[PDB]
Design a protein around this ligand. Structure first.
Ligand SMILES: *[C@@H]1O[C@H](CO)[C@@H](O[C@@H]2O[C@H](CO)[C@@H](O[C@@H]3O[C@H](CO[C@H]4O[C@H](CO)[C@@H](O)[C@H](O)[C@@H]4O[C@H]4O[C@H](CO)[C@@H](O)[C@H](O)[C@@H]4O)[C@@H](O)[C@H](O[C@H]4O[C@H](CO)[C@@H](O)[C@H](O)[C@@H]4O)[C@@H]3O)[C@H](O)[C@H]2NC(C)=O)[C@H](O)[C@H]1NC(C)=O
Ligand SMILES: *[C@@H]1O[C@H](CO)[C@@H](O[C@@H]2O[C@H](CO)[C@@H](O)[C@H](O)[C@H]2NC(C)=O)[C@H](O)[C@H]1NC(C)=O
Ligand SMILES: OC[C@H]1O[C@@](CO)(O[C@H]2O[C@H](CO)[C@@H](O)[C@H](O)[C@H]2O)[C@@H](O)[C@@H]1O
Ligand SMILES: *[C@@H]1O[C@H](CO)[C@@H](O)[C@H](O)[C@H]1NC(C)=O
Ligand SMILES: [Zn+2]
Ligand SMILES: [Zn+2]
Ligand SMILES: [Zn+2]
Ligand SMILES: [Zn+2]
Length: 534
């Protein structure tokens, strides 16, 4: 039996999964490739497994598309991206491991451009198109994950590749006139000292005002204003960070509008190796993200699988322009049951809980609107409290604040032996203005009776005004919780493995352990139907 397998998240029928690869749309069909281990449930024998969808929620399997077959990828087929050439033709740039264990860059073309499921791919004999050597002096063990490519004003292709010199992470830029002969730019698009290896770089334009995505190559009209995003996966910290900034076409350099570190993450919990693509069908940019297991490696081997992708999110620039907003693709809403469980104008007094009934609690979508009564009852933040994760760590739900904790017990046992808390605290900011600080925590210290699991607590700040009602959403899916505070302004994914709170035996609460009572304006819980995934 498989109590931890998800009913509506992407995962292979079995075995190991990590980074999402080459996502794209071709002929109105969504593709996902992914790092897969056909043999075991740990990392190894890494191939590009392949699935397709018409809605990003339901996925049909297909045989691996890119696996070791030539000198340029004999030892493995690591991450990479698909670019759509201006004639509609899709191509994949990916890292291969050559016979000398060097990380080289390889191209793949589809074999039959009339196959709408793009089943089979052909690799040029001219690969590697891009390799470390003695001239360029690139570290051969640190030259991976090409991005989607963007065509410049000079009709010349750009692509970046994640790397590092010493402790210096950088994005090595390559330019091409024809997409077959790539020459290394003398200059990195960007670099940061003391960061370490830059994995899974991503680089895409985003609109200054609007929710709609931007074609990756689009130019910044004097009448339509664009900003650029650079996303990196830091091998050392194991997190994804982005920075908003201007792309100087002349220099070919990314300049983050400081400050901009102190850098934002897409997701403040378990989330890594993320990658975007342009959904040309609906003009949105979609973000894919890998959430690995928090269980022991011992358990992965026993259950026979490891790793899932989050629900893919629509991503756009917030009005302030200081951060990105994410929100689960609207298609996942189709999985909702018809009978919505609703609760209005309820009062959660100090130390109270309110069970949501009549919803499959291990497989649900839930949205709360909290409202605080009197902001002047908020504790002033301690001057030293600047790391949101450490704040949530020290003050568990048992520690009372003026305002908070209030939020949700999810994947909870009847008598709360096991529960995962996704909650808020409100503070008054340490400055002359009447600014407030909203804290969002994902607490999984008491999420499972088995101690073996990674019970690390996650935290994020939310840029919303608590004069307004506080918004919280949670997608609950057996062993994964995806929490969104402030309508997508703060995202936290976590992985919990309850011993008691399983399937029919799991419950859903809204709670409040603050000193002050808070109002639940509105709460909606939908049971979530299963998806058709390989
Ligand atoms: C794939 O999944 C892997 C497992 O899920 C994952 O690796 C795991 O990563 C997490 C972090 O995301 C590791 O977290 C554990 O947390 C403890 C340290 O926490 C301290 O700092 C935290 C903030 O970073 C706070 O939340 C805590 O309060 C705590 O704070 C104390 O210390 C700080 C600074 O030192 C100080 O400021 C405070 O005052 C506090 O005193 C540790 O206890 C854990 O150590 C454990 O793991 C190692 C394994 O090598 C072993 O020594 C033991 O098992 C030990 O229990 C740990 O750091 C977690 O450990 C990781 N697990 C493993 C097996 O590596 C991996 O990141 C995922 N991959 C991707 C790509 O997402
Ligand atoms: C090139 O990058 C590689 C990959 O990170 C470096 O190898 C690691 O760092 C040192 C080697 O001096 C060792 O402590 C580790 O064993 C290596 N990492 C692992 C576990 O694979 C290498 O140092 C870099 N080379 C140079 C000269 O920059
Ligand atoms: O599967 C390889 C693929 O994964 C990434 C990002 O998830 O790197 C992971 O795997 C590497 C190969 O062992 C590790 O060195 C690295 O620490 C880990 O994050 C990509 O960089 C790579 O293309
Ligand atoms: C590719 O095009 C279509 C795929 O649907 C198929 O009818 C045809 O046989 C394929 N072409 C060949 C010969 O590979
Ligand atoms: Zn289908
Ligand atoms: Zn920087
Ligand atoms: Zn960390
Ligand atoms: Zn006020």
């Amino acid at each position: 039996n498989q109590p931890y397998r998800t009913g509506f998240h992407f995962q292979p029928p079995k075995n190991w999964m990590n980074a999402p690869n080459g996502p794209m749309i071709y002929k109105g069909i969504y593709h996902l490739f992914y790092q897969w281990n056909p043999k075991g449930a740990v990392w190894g024998n890494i191939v590009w497994a392949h699935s397709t969808s018409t809605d990003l929620i339901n996925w049909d399997p297909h045989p691996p598309a890119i696996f070791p077959s030539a000198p340029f990828d004999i030892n493995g087929c690591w991450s990479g991206s698909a670019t759509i050439l201006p004639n509609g033709k899709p191509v994949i740039l990916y890292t291969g491991i050559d016979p000398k264990n060097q990380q080289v860059q390889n191209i793949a073309e589809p074999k039959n451009l009339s196959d709408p499921y793009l089943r089979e791919w052909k690799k040029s004999p001219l690969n590697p198109l891009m390799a470390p050597d003695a001239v360029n002096g690139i570290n051969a063990s640190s030259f991976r994950d090409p991005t989607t490519a963007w065509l410049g004003q000079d009709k010349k292709w750009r692509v970046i590749i994640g790397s590092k010199i010493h402790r210096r992470g950088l994005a090595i830029t390559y330019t091409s006139k024809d997409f077959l002969k790539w020459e290394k730019s003398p200059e990195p698009l960007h670099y940061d000292d003391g960061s370490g290896m830059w994995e899974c770089p991503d680089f895409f334009p985003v609109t200054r005002f609007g929710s709609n995505g931007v074609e990756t190559s689009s130019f910044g009209e004097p009448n339509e204003i664009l900003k650029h995003v650079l996303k990196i996966s830091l091998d050392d910290t194991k997190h994804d960070y982005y920075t908003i900034g201007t792309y100087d076409r002349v220099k070919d350099k990314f300049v983050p509008d400081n400050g901009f570190g102190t850098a934002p993450r897409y997701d403040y919990g378990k989330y890594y190796a993320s990658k975007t693509f342009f959904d040309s069908a609906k003009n949105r940019r979609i973000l894919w993200g890998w959430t690995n297991e928090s269980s022991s490696v011992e358990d992965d081997v026993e259950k026979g699988w490891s790793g899932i992708q989050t629900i893919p999110r629509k991503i756009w620039l917030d009005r302030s322009g200081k951060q990105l907003i994410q929100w689960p693709v609207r298609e996942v809403e189709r999985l909702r049951t018809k009978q919505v469980k609703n609760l209005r104008n309820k009062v959660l007094k100090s130390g109270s809980r309110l069970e949501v009934y009549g919803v499959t609690a291990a497989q649900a979508d839930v949205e709360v609107l909290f409202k605080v009564r009197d902001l002047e009852k908020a504790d002033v933040i301690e001057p030293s409290w600047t790391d949101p994760q450490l704040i949530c760590s020290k003050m568990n739900v048992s520690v009372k604040s003026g305002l908070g904790p209030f939020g949700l017990m999810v994947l909870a046992s009847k008598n709360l032996e096991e529960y995962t808390s996704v909650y808020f605290r409100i503070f008054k900011a340490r400055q002359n203005s009447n600014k407030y600080v909203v804290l969002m925590c994902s607490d999984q210290s008491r999420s499972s009776l088995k101690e073996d699991n990674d019970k690390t607590t996650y935290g994020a700040f939310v840029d919303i005004n608590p004069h307004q009602p506080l918004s919280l959403r949670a997608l609950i899916d057996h062993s994964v919780v995806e929490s969104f505070g402030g309508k997508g302004r703060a995202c936290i994914t976590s992985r919990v493995y309850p011993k008691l709170a399983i399937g029919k035996s799991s419950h859903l609460f809204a709670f409040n352990y603050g000193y002050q009572s808070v109002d639940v304006l509105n709460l909606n819980a939908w049971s979530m139907n299963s998806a058709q995934i390989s």
